[PDB]
CSV table of C-alpha atoms in Angstrom, one decimal:
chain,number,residue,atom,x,y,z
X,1,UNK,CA,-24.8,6.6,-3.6
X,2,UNK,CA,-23.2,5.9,-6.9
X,3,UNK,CA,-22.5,2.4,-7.4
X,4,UNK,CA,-21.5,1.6,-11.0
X,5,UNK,CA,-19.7,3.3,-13.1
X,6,UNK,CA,-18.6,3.4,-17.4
X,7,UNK,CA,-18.4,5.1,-20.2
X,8,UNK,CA,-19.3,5.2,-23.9
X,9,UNK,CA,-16.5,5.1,-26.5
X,10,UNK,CA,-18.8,7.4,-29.0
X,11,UNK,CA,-19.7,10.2,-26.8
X,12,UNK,CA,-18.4,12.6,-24.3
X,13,UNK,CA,-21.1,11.1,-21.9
X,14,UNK,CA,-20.7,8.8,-18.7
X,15,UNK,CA,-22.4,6.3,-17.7
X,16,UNK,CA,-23.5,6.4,-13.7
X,17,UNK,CA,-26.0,4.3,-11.0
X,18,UNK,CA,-26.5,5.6,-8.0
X,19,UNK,CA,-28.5,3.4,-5.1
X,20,UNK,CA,-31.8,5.0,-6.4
X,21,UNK,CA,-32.6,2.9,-9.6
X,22,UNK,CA,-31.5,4.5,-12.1
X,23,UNK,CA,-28.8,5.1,-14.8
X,24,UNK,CA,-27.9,7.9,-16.0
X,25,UNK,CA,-25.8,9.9,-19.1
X,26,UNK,CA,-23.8,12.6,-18.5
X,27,UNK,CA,-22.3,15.7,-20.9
X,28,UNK,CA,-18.7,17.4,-20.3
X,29,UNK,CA,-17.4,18.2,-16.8
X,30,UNK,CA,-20.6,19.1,-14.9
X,31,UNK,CA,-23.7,18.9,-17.3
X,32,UNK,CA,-26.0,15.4,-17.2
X,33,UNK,CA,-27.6,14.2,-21.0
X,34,UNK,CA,-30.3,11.8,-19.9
X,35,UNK,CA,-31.5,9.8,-16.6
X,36,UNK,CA,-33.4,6.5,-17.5
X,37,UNK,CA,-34.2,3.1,-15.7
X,38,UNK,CA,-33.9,0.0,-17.0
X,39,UNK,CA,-34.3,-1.8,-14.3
X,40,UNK,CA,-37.2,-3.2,-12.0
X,41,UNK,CA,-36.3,-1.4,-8.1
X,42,UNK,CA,-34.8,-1.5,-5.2
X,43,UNK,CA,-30.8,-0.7,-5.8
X,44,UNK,CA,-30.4,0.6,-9.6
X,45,UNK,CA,-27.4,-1.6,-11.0
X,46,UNK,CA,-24.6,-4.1,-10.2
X,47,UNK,CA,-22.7,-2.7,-13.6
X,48,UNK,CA,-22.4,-0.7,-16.5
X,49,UNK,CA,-20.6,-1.4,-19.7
X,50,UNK,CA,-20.2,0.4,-23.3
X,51,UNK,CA,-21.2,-1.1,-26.9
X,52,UNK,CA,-20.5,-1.3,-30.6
X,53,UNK,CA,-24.6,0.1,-30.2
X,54,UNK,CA,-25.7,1.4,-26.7
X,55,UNK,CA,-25.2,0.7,-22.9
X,56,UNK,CA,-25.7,-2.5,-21.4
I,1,UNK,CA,-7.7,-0.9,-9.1
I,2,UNK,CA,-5.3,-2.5,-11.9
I,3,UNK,CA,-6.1,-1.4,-15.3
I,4,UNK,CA,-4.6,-2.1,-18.6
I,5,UNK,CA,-4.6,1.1,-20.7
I,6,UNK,CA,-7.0,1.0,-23.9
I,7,UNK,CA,-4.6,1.8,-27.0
I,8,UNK,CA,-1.5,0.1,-24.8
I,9,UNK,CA,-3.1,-3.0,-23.8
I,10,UNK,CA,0.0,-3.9,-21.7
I,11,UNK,CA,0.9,-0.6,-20.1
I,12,UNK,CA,-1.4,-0.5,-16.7
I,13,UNK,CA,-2.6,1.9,-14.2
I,14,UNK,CA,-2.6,0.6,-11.0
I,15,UNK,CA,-4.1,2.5,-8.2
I,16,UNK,CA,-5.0,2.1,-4.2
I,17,UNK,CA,-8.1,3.1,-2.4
I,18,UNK,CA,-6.9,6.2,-0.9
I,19,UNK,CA,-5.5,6.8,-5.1
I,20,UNK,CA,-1.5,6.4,-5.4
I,21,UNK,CA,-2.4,5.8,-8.8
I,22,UNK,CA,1.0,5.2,-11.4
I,23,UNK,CA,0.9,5.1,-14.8
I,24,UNK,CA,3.1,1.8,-14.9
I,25,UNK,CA,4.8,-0.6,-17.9
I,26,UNK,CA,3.8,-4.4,-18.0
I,27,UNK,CA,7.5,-5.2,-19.1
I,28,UNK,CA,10.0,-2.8,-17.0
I,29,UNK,CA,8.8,-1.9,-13.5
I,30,UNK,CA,11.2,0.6,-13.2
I,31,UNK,CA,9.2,3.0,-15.7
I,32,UNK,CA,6.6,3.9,-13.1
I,33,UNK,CA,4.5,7.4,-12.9
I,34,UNK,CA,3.4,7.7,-9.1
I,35,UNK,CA,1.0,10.3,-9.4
I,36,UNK,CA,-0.1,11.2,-5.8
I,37,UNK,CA,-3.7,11.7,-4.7
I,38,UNK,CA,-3.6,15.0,-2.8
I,39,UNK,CA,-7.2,14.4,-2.0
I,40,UNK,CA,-9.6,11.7,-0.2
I,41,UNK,CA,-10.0,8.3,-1.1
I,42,UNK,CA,-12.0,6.7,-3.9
I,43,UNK,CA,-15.1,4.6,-4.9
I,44,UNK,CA,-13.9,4.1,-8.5
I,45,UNK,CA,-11.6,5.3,-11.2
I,46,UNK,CA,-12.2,5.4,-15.1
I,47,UNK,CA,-9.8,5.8,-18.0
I,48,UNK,CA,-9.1,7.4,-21.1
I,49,UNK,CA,-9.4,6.4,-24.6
I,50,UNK,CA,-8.2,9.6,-25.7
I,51,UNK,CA,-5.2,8.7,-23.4
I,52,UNK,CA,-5.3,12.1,-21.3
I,53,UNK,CA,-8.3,11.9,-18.7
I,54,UNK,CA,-8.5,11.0,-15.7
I,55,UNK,CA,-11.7,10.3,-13.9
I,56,UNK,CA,-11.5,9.8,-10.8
I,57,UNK,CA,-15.0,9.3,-8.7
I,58,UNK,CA,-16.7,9.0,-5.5
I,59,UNK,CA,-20.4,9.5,-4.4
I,60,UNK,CA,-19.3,13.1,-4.6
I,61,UNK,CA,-20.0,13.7,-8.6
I,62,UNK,CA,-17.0,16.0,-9.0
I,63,UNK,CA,-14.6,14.8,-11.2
I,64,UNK,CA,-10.4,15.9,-12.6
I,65,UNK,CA,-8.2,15.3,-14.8
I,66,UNK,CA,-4.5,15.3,-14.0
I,67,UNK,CA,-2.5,15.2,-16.8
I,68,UNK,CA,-0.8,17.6,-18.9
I,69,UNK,CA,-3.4,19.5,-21.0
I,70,UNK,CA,-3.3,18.3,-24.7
I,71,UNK,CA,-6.6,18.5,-25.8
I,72,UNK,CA,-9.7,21.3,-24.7
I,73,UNK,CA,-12.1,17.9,-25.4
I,74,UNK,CA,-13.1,15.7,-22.2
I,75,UNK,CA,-13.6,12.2,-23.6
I,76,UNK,CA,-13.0,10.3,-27.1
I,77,UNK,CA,-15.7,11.2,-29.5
I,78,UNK,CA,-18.5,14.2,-30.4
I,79,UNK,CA,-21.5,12.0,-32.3
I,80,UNK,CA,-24.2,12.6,-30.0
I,81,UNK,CA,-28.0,12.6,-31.7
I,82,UNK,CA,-29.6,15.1,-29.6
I,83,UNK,CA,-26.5,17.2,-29.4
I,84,UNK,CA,-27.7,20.7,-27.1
I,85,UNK,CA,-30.9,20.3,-29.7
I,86,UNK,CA,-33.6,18.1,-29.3
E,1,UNK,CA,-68.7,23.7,-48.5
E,2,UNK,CA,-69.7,23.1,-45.1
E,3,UNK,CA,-68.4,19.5,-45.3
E,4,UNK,CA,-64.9,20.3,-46.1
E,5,UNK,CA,-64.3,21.2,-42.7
E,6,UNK,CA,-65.8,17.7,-41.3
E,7,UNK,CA,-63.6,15.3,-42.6
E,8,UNK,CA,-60.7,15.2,-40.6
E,9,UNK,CA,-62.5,12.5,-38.4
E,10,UNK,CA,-61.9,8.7,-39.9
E,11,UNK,CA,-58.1,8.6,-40.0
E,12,UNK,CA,-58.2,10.5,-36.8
E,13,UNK,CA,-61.1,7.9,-35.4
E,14,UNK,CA,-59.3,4.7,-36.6
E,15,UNK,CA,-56.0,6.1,-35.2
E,16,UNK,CA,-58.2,6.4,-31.5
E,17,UNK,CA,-59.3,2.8,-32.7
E,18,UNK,CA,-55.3,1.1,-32.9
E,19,UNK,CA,-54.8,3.5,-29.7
E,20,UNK,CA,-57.4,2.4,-27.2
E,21,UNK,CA,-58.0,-0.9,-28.9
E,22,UNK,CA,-54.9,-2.1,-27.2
E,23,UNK,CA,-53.7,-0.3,-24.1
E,24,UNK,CA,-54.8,-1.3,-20.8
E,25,UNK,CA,-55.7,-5.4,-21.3
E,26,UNK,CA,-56.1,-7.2,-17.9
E,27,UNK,CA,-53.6,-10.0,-18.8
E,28,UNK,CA,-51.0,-7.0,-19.8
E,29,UNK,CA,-52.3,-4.6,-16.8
E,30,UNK,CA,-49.6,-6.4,-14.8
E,31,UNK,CA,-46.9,-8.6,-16.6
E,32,UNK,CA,-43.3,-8.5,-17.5
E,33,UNK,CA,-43.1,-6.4,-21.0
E,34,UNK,CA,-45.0,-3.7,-19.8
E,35,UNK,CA,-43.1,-2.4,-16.6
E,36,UNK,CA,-40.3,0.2,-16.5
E,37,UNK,CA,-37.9,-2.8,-17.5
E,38,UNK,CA,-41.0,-3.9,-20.0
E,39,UNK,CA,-41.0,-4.1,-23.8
E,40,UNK,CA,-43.3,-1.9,-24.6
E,41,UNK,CA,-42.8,0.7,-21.9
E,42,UNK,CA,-42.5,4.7,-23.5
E,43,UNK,CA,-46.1,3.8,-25.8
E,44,UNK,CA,-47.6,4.2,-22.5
E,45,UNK,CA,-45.6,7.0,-21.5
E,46,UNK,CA,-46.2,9.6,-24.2
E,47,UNK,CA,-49.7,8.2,-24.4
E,48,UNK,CA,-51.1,10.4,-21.5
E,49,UNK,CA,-47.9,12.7,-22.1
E,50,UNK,CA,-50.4,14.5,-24.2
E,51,UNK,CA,-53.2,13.6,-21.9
E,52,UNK,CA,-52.4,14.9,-18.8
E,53,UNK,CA,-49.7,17.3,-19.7
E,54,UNK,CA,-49.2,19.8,-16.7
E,55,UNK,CA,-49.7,23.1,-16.9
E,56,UNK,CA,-47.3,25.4,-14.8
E,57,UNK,CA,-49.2,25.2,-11.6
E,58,UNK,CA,-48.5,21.5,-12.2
E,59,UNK,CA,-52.5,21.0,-13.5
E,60,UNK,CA,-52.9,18.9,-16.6
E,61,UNK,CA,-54.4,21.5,-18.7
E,62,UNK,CA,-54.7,20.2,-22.6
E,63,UNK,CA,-54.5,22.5,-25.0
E,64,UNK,CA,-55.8,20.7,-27.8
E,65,UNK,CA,-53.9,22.5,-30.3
E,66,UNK,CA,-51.0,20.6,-28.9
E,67,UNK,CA,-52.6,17.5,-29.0
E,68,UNK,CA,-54.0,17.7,-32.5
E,69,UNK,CA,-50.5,18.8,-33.3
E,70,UNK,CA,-48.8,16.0,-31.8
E,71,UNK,CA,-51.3,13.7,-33.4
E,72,UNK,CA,-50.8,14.9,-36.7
E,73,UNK,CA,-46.8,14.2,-35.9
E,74,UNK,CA,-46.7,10.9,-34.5
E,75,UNK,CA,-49.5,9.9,-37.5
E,76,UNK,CA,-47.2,10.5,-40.3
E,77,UNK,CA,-44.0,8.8,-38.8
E,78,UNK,CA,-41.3,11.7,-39.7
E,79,UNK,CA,-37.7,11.5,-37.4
E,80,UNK,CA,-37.7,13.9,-34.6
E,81,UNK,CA,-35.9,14.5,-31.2
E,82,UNK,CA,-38.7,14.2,-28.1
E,83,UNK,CA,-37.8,14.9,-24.1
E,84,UNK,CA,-39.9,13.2,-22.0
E,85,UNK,CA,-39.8,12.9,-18.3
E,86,UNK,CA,-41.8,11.2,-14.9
E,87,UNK,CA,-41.8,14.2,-13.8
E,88,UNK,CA,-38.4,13.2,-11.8
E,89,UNK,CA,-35.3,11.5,-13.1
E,90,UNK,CA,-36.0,8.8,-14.7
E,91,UNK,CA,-37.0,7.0,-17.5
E,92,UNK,CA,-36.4,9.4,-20.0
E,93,UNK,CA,-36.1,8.6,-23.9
E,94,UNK,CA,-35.6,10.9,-26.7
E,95,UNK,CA,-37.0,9.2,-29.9
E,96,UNK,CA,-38.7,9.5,-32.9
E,97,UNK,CA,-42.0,8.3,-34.8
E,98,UNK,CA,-41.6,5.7,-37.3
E,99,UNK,CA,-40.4,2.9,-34.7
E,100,UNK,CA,-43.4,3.6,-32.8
E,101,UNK,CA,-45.3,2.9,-35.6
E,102,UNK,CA,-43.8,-0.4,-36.3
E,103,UNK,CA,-44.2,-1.7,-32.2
E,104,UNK,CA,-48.2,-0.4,-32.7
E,105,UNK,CA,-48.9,-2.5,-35.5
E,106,UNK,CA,-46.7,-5.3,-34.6
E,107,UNK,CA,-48.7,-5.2,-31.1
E,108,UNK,CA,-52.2,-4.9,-32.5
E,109,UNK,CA,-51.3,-7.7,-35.5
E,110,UNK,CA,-49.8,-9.9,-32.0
E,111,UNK,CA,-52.9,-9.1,-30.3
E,112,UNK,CA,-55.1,-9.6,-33.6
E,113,UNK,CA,-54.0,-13.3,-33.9
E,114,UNK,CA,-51.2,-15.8,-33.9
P,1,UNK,CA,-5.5,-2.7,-51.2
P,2,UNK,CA,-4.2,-0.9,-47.9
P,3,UNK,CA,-6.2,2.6,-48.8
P,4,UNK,CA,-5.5,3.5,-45.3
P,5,UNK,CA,-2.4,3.5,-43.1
P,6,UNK,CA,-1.2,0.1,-42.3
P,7,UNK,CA,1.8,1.3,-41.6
P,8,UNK,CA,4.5,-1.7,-41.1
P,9,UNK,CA,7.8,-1.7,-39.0
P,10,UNK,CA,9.7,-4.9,-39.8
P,11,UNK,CA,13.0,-6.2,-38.2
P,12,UNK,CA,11.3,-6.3,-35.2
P,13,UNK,CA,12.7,-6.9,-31.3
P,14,UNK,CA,12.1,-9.5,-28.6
P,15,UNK,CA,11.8,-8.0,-25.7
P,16,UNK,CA,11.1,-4.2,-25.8
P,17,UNK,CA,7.5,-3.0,-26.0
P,18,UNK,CA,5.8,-0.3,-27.6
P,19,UNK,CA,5.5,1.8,-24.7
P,20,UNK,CA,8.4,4.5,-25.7
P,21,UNK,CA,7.0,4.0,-29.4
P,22,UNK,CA,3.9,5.4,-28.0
P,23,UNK,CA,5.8,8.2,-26.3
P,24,UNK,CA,7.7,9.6,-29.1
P,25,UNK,CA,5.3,10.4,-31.6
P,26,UNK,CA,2.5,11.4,-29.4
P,27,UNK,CA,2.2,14.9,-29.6
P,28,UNK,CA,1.4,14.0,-33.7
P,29,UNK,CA,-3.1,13.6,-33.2
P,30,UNK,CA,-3.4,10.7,-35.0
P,31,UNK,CA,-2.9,7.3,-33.3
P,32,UNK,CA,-5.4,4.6,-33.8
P,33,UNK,CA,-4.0,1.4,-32.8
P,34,UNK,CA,-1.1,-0.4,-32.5
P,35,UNK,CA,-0.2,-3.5,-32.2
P,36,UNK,CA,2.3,-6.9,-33.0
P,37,UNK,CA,-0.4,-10.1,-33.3
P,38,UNK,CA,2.0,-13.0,-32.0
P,39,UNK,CA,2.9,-16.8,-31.8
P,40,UNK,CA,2.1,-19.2,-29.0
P,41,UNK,CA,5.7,-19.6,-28.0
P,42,UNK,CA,7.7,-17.2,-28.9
P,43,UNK,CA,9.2,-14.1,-26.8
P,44,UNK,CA,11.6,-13.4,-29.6
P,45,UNK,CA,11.5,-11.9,-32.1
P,46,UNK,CA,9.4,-12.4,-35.5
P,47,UNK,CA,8.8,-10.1,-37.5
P,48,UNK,CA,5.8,-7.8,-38.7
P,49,UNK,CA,4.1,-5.1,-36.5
P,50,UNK,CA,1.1,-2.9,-36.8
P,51,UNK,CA,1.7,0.9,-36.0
P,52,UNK,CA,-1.8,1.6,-37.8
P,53,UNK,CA,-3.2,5.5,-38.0
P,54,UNK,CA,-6.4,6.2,-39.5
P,55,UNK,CA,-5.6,6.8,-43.3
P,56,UNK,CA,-2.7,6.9,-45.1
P,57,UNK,CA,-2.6,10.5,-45.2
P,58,UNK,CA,-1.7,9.6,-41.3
P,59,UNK,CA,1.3,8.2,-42.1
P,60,UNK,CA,2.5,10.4,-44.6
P,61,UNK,CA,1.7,13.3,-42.6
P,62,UNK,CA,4.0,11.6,-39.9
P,63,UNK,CA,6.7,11.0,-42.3
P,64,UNK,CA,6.6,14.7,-43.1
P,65,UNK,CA,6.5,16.1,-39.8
P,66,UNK,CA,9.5,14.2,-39.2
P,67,UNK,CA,10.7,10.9,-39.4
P,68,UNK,CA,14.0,8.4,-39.7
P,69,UNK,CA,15.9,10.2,-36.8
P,70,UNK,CA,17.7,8.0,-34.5
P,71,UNK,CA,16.4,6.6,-31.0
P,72,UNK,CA,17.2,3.2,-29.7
P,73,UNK,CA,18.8,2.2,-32.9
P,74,UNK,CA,15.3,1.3,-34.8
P,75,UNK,CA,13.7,3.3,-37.9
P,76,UNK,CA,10.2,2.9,-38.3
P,77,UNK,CA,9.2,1.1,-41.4
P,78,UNK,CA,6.7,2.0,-43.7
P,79,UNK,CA,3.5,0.1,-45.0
P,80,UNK,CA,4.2,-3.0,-47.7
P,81,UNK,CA,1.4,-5.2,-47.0
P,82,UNK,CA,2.1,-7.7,-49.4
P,83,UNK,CA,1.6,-11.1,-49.3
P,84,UNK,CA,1.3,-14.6,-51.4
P,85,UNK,CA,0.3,-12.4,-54.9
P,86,UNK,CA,3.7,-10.4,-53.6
P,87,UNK,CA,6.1,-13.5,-54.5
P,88,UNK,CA,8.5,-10.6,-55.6
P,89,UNK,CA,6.8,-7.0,-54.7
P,90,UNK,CA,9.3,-6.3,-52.3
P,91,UNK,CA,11.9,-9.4,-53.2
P,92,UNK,CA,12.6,-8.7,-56.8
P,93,UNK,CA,16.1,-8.1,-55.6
P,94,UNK,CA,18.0,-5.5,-55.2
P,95,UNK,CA,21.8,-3.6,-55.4
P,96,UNK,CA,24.4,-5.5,-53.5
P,97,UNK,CA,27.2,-3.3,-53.0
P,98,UNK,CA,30.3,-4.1,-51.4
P,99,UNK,CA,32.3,-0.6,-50.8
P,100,UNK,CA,29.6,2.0,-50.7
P,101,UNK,CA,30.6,5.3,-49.9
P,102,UNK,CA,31.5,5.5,-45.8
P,103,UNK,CA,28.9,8.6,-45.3
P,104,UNK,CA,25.8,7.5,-47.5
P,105,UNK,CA,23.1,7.5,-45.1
P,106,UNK,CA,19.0,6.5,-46.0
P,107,UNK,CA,17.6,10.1,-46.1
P,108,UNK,CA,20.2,11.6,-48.2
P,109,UNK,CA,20.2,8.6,-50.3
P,110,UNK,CA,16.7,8.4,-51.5
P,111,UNK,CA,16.5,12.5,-51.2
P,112,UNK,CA,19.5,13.5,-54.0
P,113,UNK,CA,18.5,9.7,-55.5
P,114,UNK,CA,14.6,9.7,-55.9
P,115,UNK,CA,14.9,11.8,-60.0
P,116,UNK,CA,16.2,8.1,-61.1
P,117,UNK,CA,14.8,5.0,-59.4
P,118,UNK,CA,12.8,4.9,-56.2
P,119,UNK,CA,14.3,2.6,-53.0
P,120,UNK,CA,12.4,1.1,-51.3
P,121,UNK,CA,14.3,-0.8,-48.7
P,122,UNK,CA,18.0,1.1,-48.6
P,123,UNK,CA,19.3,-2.0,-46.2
P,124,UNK,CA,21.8,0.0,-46.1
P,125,UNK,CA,24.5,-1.0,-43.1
P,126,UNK,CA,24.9,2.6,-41.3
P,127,UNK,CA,27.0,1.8,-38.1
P,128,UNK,CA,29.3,3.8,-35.3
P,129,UNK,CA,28.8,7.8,-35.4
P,130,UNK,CA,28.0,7.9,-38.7
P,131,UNK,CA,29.4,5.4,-41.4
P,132,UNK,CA,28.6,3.5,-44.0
P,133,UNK,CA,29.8,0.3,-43.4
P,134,UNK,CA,30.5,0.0,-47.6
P,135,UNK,CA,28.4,-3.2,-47.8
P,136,UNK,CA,24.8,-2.1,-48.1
P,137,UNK,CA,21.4,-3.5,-50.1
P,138,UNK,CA,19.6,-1.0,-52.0
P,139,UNK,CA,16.5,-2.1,-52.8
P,140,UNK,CA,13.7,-1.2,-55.3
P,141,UNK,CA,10.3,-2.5,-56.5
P,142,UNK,CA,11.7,-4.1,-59.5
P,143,UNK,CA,15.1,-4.7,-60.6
P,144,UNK,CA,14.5,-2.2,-63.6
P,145,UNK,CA,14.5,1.0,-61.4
P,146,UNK,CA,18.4,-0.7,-60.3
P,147,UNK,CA,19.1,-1.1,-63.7
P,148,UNK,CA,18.7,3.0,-64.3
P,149,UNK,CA,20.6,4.0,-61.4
P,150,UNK,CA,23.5,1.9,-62.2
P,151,UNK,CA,23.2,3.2,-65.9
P,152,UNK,CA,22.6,6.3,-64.4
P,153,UNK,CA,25.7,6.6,-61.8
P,154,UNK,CA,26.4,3.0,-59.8
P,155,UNK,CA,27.4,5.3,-57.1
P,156,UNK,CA,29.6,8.3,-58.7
P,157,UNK,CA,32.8,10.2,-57.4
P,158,UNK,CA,32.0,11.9,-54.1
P,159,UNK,CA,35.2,11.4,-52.2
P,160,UNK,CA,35.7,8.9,-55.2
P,161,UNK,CA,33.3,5.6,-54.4
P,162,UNK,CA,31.6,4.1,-57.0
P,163,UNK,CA,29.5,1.8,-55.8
P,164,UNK,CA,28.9,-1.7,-56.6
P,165,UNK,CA,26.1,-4.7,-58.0
């Protein structure tokens, strides 16, 4: 269900949204960080990007 | 998918949906890299600032790297703030 | 003697005071910086984090020792690392004290007037 | 200035990238960013690049892993960084010599010559398997540094060729 997908260029995390509203952080190969929402419902997110900061 | 690489920001991947992905110049076509994709097709396809990683990913969350293997590390950089510890 | 063991009440009251003075306002019940893509989201969050933490059977049991604790902790404003879930994934935000001291009295001097 | 690497190839190309750059001295770690900033009209050449590493420990640690050995006719040039205060960092001239010695490469060069004066652009014309081609520009950070080699040695008898002003 994934549907956006980046990185961040100050961790060995990724940055994923699936079709169930979230977005979430992920560790090396198979291990996830965190799993937040920013955003209201329905689908989670049309994109992802990466930050001097944080994740947009 | 048609990518400009990070630290050569003329030096493109390019890559289809089922994934004949090649490591390709901007300036001579000739120097191409046609890595095969001995696997099923794609959603999307991320890079490497470390150079090195491939990520390629569908709704499958199952990820590889093909290149040779220069580094143990996955991605570019180790500050994390809860690192294994909060 | 016997009222040395009494006192821990007036910072503890004021803090209920700047808690429940400003938490569940009818104009901010419902309203944009209050959802899950709100402003002030994760003071709600932890709010009745403490108060209805589940127990293993999934009862929120509370264990006042624990919430005494935490109250202490989140009173003085020191950095430390907190997980915090729905239960389910989402919404999760590992933070520390002092900046949630700083949106408290910025909300209850916004609230106390313009 | 320039605490950190900065380190800058001049005598630069039109038309080739830095894509085998890249691949030679990859397996080194430490590669931050490179890059030639350009003109608006102008696939030619013109003249200053940016192979940049992290510090300037980088660079040295590249020159001393190994470095000046010949690919595709181009030697990568090291950090100067020198602008409008630099009127003469790098142009307070240098050693004009018409007959140098036909085997005198750069490494060689500064290695038995850096106990009297240190080059620091040996413009020197190395051409065809290995040969001097006797006119060459060795080049200092002052014209004082010269002035001790030549009072030194100006050039000394190796196969007999002194070398010239």
């Amino acid at each position: 269900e994934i549907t956006a997908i980046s990185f961040d260029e100050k961790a060995n995390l990724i940055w994923s949204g699936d079709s169930y509203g979230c977005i979430s952080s992920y560790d090396p190969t198979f291990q996830l960080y965190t799993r937040y929402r920013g955003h209201i419902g329905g689908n989670s997110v049309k994109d992802i990007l990466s930050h001097r900061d944080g994740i947009l | 998918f048609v990518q400009l690489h990070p630290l050569l920001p003329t030096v493109m991947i390019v890559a289809s949906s089922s994934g004949s992905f090649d490591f390709i110049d901007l300036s001579n076509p000739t120097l191409r890299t046609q890595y095969v994709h001995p696997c099923q097709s794609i959603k999307k396809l991320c890079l490497s600032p470390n150079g090195d990683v491939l990520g390629i990913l569908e709704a499958d969350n199952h990820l590889d790297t093909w290149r040779r293997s220069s580094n143990n590390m996955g991605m570019f950089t180790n500050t994390p703030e809860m690192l294994a510890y909060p | 003697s016997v009222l040395s063991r009494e006192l821990e009440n007036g910072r503890l009251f004021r803090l209920v005071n700047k808690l429940n003075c400003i938490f569940g306002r009818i104009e901010s019940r419902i309203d944009i910086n209050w959802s899950e893509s709100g402003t002030k989201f994760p003071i709600i969050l932890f709010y009745d984090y403490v108060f209805h933490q589940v127990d293993s059977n999934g009862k929120p049991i509370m264990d006042l020792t624990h919430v005494l604790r935490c109250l202490n902790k989140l009173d003085a404003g020191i950095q430390e690392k907190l997980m915090l879930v729905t239960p389910d994934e989402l919404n999760c935000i590992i933070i520390s004290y002092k900046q949630l001291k700083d949106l408290i009295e910025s909300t209850f001097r916004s609230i106390t007037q313009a | 200035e320039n605490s950190s690497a900065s380190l800058y190839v001049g005598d630069l190309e039109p038309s080739v990238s830095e894509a085998h750059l890249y691949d030679i001295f990859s397996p080194i770690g430490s590669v931050s960013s490179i890059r030639v900033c350009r003109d608006a009209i102008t696939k030619t050449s013109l003249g200053y690049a940016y192979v940049n590493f992290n510090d300037h420990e980088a660079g040295r640690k590249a020159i001393e892993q190994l470095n000046y050995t010949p690919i595709k006719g181009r030697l990568c040039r090291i950090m100067w960084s020198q602008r409008d205060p630099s009127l003469r960092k790098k142009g307070s001239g240098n050693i004009f010599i018409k007959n140098l010695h036909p085997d005198i490469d750069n490494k060689a060069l500064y290695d038995t010559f850096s106990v009297f004066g240190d080059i620091l652009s040996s413009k020197i014309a190395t051409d065809e398997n290995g040969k001097s081609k006797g006119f060459g520009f060795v080049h200092f950070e002052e014209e004082g540094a010269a002035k001790e080699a030549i009072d030194a040695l100006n050039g000394m008898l190796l196969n007999g060729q002194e070398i010239y002003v």
